[PDB]
Design a protein around this ligand. Structure first.
Ligand SMILES: Nc1ncnc2c1ncn2[C@@H]1O[C@H](COP(=O)(O)OP(=O)(O)O)[C@@H](O)[C@H]1O
Length: 429
């Protein structure tokens, strides 16, 4: 097999992981971003070079494929040569545009129809600049960074391109969009993991990389995190028990529900759907520090219900599994015993995950087969028991959770595992 390099540019820093997949060995390096910047592109690019520099020379001489994940909806408006013409619009920033202005360019309830989408941001830039030059380009963070390595302009992947208006189901931008004032700025879209081009000669020599090293189409940090688990059978899921509960479910068919923010990414011959609740670990942290979560959790017997019926929102408003912007946290009655209170909370969170996966199924997704767990709550075995009892499928801690590692797997193996040849055997004599 191959020594491959994955680069993860996330919300607060970047990480690089190089893996020798025959020896199953690896090296990891990282850089931390400032909270603010006058020149984010400079920060990101310098981070890229820092990461490469930190990798030992002998590893660098062996890297054959490279891939990059970036944050979703972080975009840059660049000239022909890839120089940013204005500040980037970050993944979390929303644009004050009329979504009706986009209606002719994507299907109804397409995921791009959101004030934070790459498409919303390109349109905002169009209105702000008046008329965008056709030789210019819009690039996602991942796009721009890989451009620093392979020199090929206007290149993206069908994960990052989704919220720019790509329709992975028909593998195209709508003709209406391509023919519009914005068409000339759109990227050519490839499958994540496919080789875009060889590394730039000068970059290869500067950093001691093979000049035959290939740079692959990238992905988003969220998807990269899913790729880290190794899951590739429809029905397999990764639950992230973090500040919020985030569900990702591998499915044979695409599902969507704009009301609850549910949409699907293409993933080889399959689809990755999911959803994000406002409930999660942040609610727990409002009441208990991690050490207390531990010390109290081991006093809980999950085989006996608490009698408490909580909905553990950290504040007003729920998004998923069921949308209600007015929904109140339901945290009463609060019993005297903190152990029982914590059990009530864990039971509530468990209901959020249970209803979440069952909901995805009810929208048409492949029925849940098993769950891999990531995030701060993953090692809570009492919570794991409650979840297993409520959901009725095997649950375990994900083998790997690092987005950089998922992206390294993407560089090494692409999306080959995500096709029906790998399904469970049904052969019987
Ligand atoms: N033993 C535990 N059981 C349940 N939740 C925990 C435990 N330890 C930490 N957490 C929760 O994990 C959350 C942070 O998860 P993490 O994924 O590390 O951060 P983030 O979600 O912000 O990326 C915190 O809100 C904390 O309450």
């Amino acid at each position: 097999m191959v020594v491959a390099l994955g680069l993860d540019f996330g919300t607060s820093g970047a990480r690089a992981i190089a893996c020798d997949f025959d020896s199953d060995r690896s090296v990891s390096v990282s850089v931390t971003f400032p909270k603010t910047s006058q020149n984010w592109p400079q920060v990101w690019r310098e981070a890229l070079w820092q990461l490469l520099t930190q990798i030992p020379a002998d590893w660098r001489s062996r890297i054959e494929r490279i891939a990059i994940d970036g944050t979703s909806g972080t975009v840059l408006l660049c000239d022909r040569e890839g120089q940013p013409q204005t500040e980037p619009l970050l993944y979390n920033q929303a644009c004050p545009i009329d979504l009706a202005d986009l209606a002719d360019w994507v299907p109804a309830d397409h995921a791009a129809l959101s004030s934070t989408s790459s498409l919303a941001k390109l349109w905002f830039w169009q209105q702000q600049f008046g008329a965008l030059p056709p030789d210019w380009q819009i690039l996602a963070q991942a796009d721009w960074l890989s451009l620093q390595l392979h020199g090929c302009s206007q290149q993206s992947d069908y994960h990052n391109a989704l919220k720019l208006g790509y329709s992975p189901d028909r593998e195209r931008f709508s003709k209406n969009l391509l023919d519009s004032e914005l068409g000339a700025l759109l990227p050519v879209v490839h499958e994540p993991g496919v080789a875009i081009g060889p590394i730039l000669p000068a970059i290869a020599q500067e950093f001691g990389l093979s000049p035959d090293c290939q740079i692959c189409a990238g992905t988003t940090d969220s998807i990269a995190a899913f790729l880290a688990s190794g899951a590739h059978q429809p029905g397999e899921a990764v639950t992230s028990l973090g500040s919020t509960i985030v569900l990702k479910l591998l499915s044979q068919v695409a599902v969507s529900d704009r009301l609850t923010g549910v949409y699907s990414h293409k993933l080889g011959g399959y689809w990755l759907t999911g959803g994000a609740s406002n409930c999660g670990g942040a609610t727990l942290r409002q009441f208990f520090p991690d050490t207390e979560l531990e010390s109290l959790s081991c006093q809980i017997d999950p085989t006996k219900k608490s009698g408490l019926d909580y909905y553990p929102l950290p504040s007003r408003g729920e998004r998923f599994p069921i949308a209600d912007p007015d929904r109140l946290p339901q945290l009463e009655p609060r019993p005297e015993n903190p152990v029982q209170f914590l059990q009530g909370l864990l039971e509530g969170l468990t209901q959020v995950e249970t209803l979440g996966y069952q909901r995805l199924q009810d929208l048409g997704a492949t029925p849940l087969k098993r769950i891999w767990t990531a995030g701060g709550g993953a090692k809570n075995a009492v919570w794991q028991q409650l979840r297993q009892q409520a959901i009725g499928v095997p649950i375990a801690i994900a083998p790997n959770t690092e987005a950089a590692f998922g992206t390294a797997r993407l560089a090494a193996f692409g999306l080959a595992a995500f096709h029906s040849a790998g399904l469970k055997r049904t052969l019987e004599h």
